[PDB]
A paper describes a structure:
Myeloid cell leukemia 1 (Mcl-1) is a key regulator of the intrinsic apoptosis pathway. Overexpression of Mcl-1 is correlated with high tumor grade, poor survival, and both intrinsic and acquired resistance to cancer therapies. Due to the need to closely regulate apoptosis, Mcl-1 binds very tightly to the BH3-only family members. All members of the Bcl-2 family possess a conserved BH3 domain, which consists of an amphipathic α-helix containing four key hydrophobic residues (L210, L213, V216, and V220 in Mcl-1), which interact with four corresponding hydrophobic pockets (P1–P4) located on the anti-apoptotic Bcl-2 family proteins. Given this large protein–protein interface that defines the binding interaction between BH3-only and anti-apoptotic family members, it is often necessary for inhibitors to exhibit extremely tight binding affinities (subnanomolar) before demonstrating activity in cellular experiments.
While a combination of both an alkyl and an ether substituent at the 4- and 5-positions (15–17) did not show an increase in cellular potency, the 4,5-dimethoxy compound 18 showed a significant improvement, with an NCI-H929 GI50 of 37 nM, a ∼5-fold increase relative to compound 10. To understand the binding interactions between the Mcl-1 protein and the 2-carboxy-1H-indol-7-yl series, we obtained the X-ray co-crystal structure of compound 18 bound to Mcl-1. The binding mode was then compared to the previously reported co-crystal structure of compound 9.85 The overall binding pose is closely preserved in both compounds. The 3,5-dimethyl-4-chlorophenol sits deep in the Mcl-1 P2 pocket where it forms an edge-to-face π-stacking interaction with Phe270. Despite the different attachment position of the C–N amide-indole bond, the indole moiety in both 9 and 18 forms a cation-π interaction with Arg263. This key interaction partially accounts for the observation whereby introduction of electron donating groups on the indole headpiece improves the binding affinity of our inhibitors. Additionally, both 9 and 18 present the carboxylic acid moiety in a similar position to the Mcl-1 peptide, where it forms a hydrogen bonding interaction with Asn260. Finally, we observe a conformational change in the Mcl-1 protein loop region to accommodate the bulkier substituted indole moiety. This occurs in the region where the peptide backbone sits closer to the small molecule, positioning the 4-methoxy group of 18 within hydrogen bonding distance of Val258. In contrast, the ether substituent at the indole 5-position is directed parallel to the shelf region of the protein, which offers significant space and an ideal vector for further exploration.
Numbering used by the authors: -196 to -23, -21 to 320
């Protein structure tokens, strides 16, 4: 659980040009004598947060920018401080994607969007609408072919259709109303229903994954796929005559892909930060570094202006950027992980018939909102307990649940602190909480005490009640500013460790019901 000094270990996804990246790594070694090892582990985006938390993991991690806010919030990423001469070399909007709480937390590499990829020998004129695909499949079935196959196991691929008629993740208005989540509105239902009808009508198969769709397209069995620039390499190898074009419309509106910026972050625990900065700035993020990677697997529209000027002339890149402009740049906020996990489950379940569309997307909504809803409740309870007066500000979206949960919490939590005063007092003294630093350390003890045994609402109340007990203390010793970080810490333990149980209860609505 310690990163070796004097070399660089890099993680990148197995669908990217890791062989090309290693070539850049060989050029680095040739100059510096430093060995660069490139790995592509399965589920690297899930592994990185676990291993980095213990001071382990790679020196550099590559992923789309959406995951990096969560990493940064957890303290896992070194701040990046390029000089102006280096910053000026990349498009300002790519830097924006890797900015979190005012600070740059990675190097942007390339802009990625999904496009429609089509076999020009089977389909000289690709469909402009989703709606015409059923009839097109019927035509192609008569030839022993099919219209469309794409990965149905990852929600990234289905999201453009879900968002077309009005589905959205976190509402953007001045900022991201994390409280306003749009995964179960009429637009999202209409899009996912269209997909589920395609499967029911035998135009697609719920089990199709990345590998199956890729093989089917690259063997000329299906006339269309939906994929990103990284996929073009393998299609070149297959010698399918393909084009890349704008995704189909749904209900007269453009498909709206979530746009990712492939980004390179530096592990906060790396003893090799200067090596990493040197590698990224002066080897990778150059014309020749990016070309080496791009020649292995296309990056998309790269962040480096000098090299993108060349790539932009490619009609596949123009198509990529057209789709991107119709879509939206992903948030990098910490709750994106939870959003993706919820929507993944919803798509799979609706596709398989395990849930209806309405059942599936309702669960997704609950799952995506759970962090913020929980924090509203816990923060307000903590602060009103500590100060003696309630917060007057409006709840917001799903404000009844919040209000009702806080009402219930007050009633059911009243007993608890009195009833367990002695044990709460004893635990308080052993913890010796004095400052914000102490608060940040509590996470481990807290997890431990809330571990094992059973899960029920009473125990959740006990968790939060001790929270309020600590908050009251923090206020009396003039550390009122520590209550909000205490609330965040309790929320994080709750929603992570109890996610599936919470969603099963219909979230905080279950709580209000249970103590009715
Ligand atoms: C093992 O299975 C259990 C355990 C519990 N309990 C009882 C005791 C151990 N307990 C519990 C909590 C809430 C979870 C942790 O809460 C926090 C802890 C820390 C360190 C922080 Cl900083 C914060 C903000 C919250 C307790 C919280 C405080 C104390 Cl002092 C105790 C406690 C008591 C009472 N006696 N002792 C010796 C201690 C250490 C806390 C906790 O989860 C269970 C259940 C089921 C329930 C229930 O139905 O209510 N409870 C409360 C359980 O499953 C069998
Ligand atoms: O499906 C959810 C998944 O979507 C995105 O991951 C993409 C990634 O951006 C692409 O570069 C490519 O590798 O395909 C992935 C989908 O399989 C998000 O970036 C990711 O965080 C999320 O889990």
């Amino acid at each position: 659980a310690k990163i070796e000094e004097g070399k660089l270990v890099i993680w990148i996804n197995g669908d990217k040009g890791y062989n090309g990246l290693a070539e850049v790594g060989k050029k680095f070694e040739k100059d510096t004598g430093i060995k660069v090892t490139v790995e592509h582990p399965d589920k690297l985006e899930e592994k990185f947060p676990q291993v980095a938390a213990t001071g382990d993991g790679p020196d550099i991690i590559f992923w789309a920018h959406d995951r990096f806010g969560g990493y940064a919030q957890s303290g896992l990423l070194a701040e990046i401080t390029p000089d102006k001469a280096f910053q000026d070399k990349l498009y300002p909007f790519t830097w924006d994607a890797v900015r979190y709480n005012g600070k740059l937390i990675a190097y942007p590499i390339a802009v990625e969007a999904l496009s429609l990829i089509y076999n020009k020998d089977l389909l000289p004129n690709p469909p402009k609408t989703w709606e015409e695909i059923p009839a097109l499949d019927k035509e192609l079935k008569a030839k022993g072919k099919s219209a469309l196959m794409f990965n149905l196991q990852e929600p990234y691929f289905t999201w453009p259709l879900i968002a077309a008629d009005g589905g959205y993740a976190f509402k953007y208005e001045n900022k991201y109303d994390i409280k306003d989540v749009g995964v179960d509105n009429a637009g999202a239902k209409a899009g996912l229903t269209f997909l589920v009808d395609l499967i029911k009508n035998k135009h697609m198969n719920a089990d199709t994954d990345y590998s199956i769709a890729e093989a089917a397209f690259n063997k000329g069995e299906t006339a269309m796929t939906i994929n990103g620039p990284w996929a073009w390499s393998n299609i070149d190898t297959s010698k399918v005559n393909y084009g890349v074009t704008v995704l189909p419309t749904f209900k007269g509106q453009p498909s709206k892909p979530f746009v990712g910026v492939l980004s390179a972050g530096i592990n906060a625990a790396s003893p090799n930060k200067e090596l990493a900065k040197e590698f990224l700035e002066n080897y990778l993020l150059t014309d020749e570094g990016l070309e080496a990677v791009n020649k292995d697997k296309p990056l998309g529209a790269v962040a480096l202006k000098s090299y993108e000027e060349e790539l932009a002339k490619d009609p596949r890149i123009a198509a990529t950027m057209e789709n991107a402009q119709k879509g939206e740049i992903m948030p990098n906020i910490p709750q994106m992980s939870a959003f993706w996990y919820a929507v993944r489950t919803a798509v799979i379940n609706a596709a398989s018939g395990r849930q209806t569309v309405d059942e599936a997307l309702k669960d997704a909504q609950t799952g995506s909102e759970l962090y913020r809803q929980s924090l509203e409740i816990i923060s307000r309870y903590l602060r009103e307990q500590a100060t003696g007066a309630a917060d007057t500000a409006p709840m917001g979206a799903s404000g009844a649940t919040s209000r009702k949960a806080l009402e219930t919490l007050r009633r059911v939590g009243d007993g608890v602190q009195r009833n367990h005063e002695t044990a709460f007092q004893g635990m308080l003294r052993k913890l010796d909480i004095k400052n914000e630093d102490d608060v940040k350390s509590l996470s481990r003890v807290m997890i431990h005490v809330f571990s094992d045994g059973v899960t029920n609402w009473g125990r959740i109340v006990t968790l939060i009640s001790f929270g309020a007990f600590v908050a009251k203390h923090l206020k009396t010793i003039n550390q009122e500013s520590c209550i909000e970080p205490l609330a965040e810490s309790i929320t994080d333990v709750l929603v992570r460790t109890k996610r599936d149980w919470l969603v099963k209860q219909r979230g905080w609505d279950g709580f209000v019901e249970f103590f009715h």
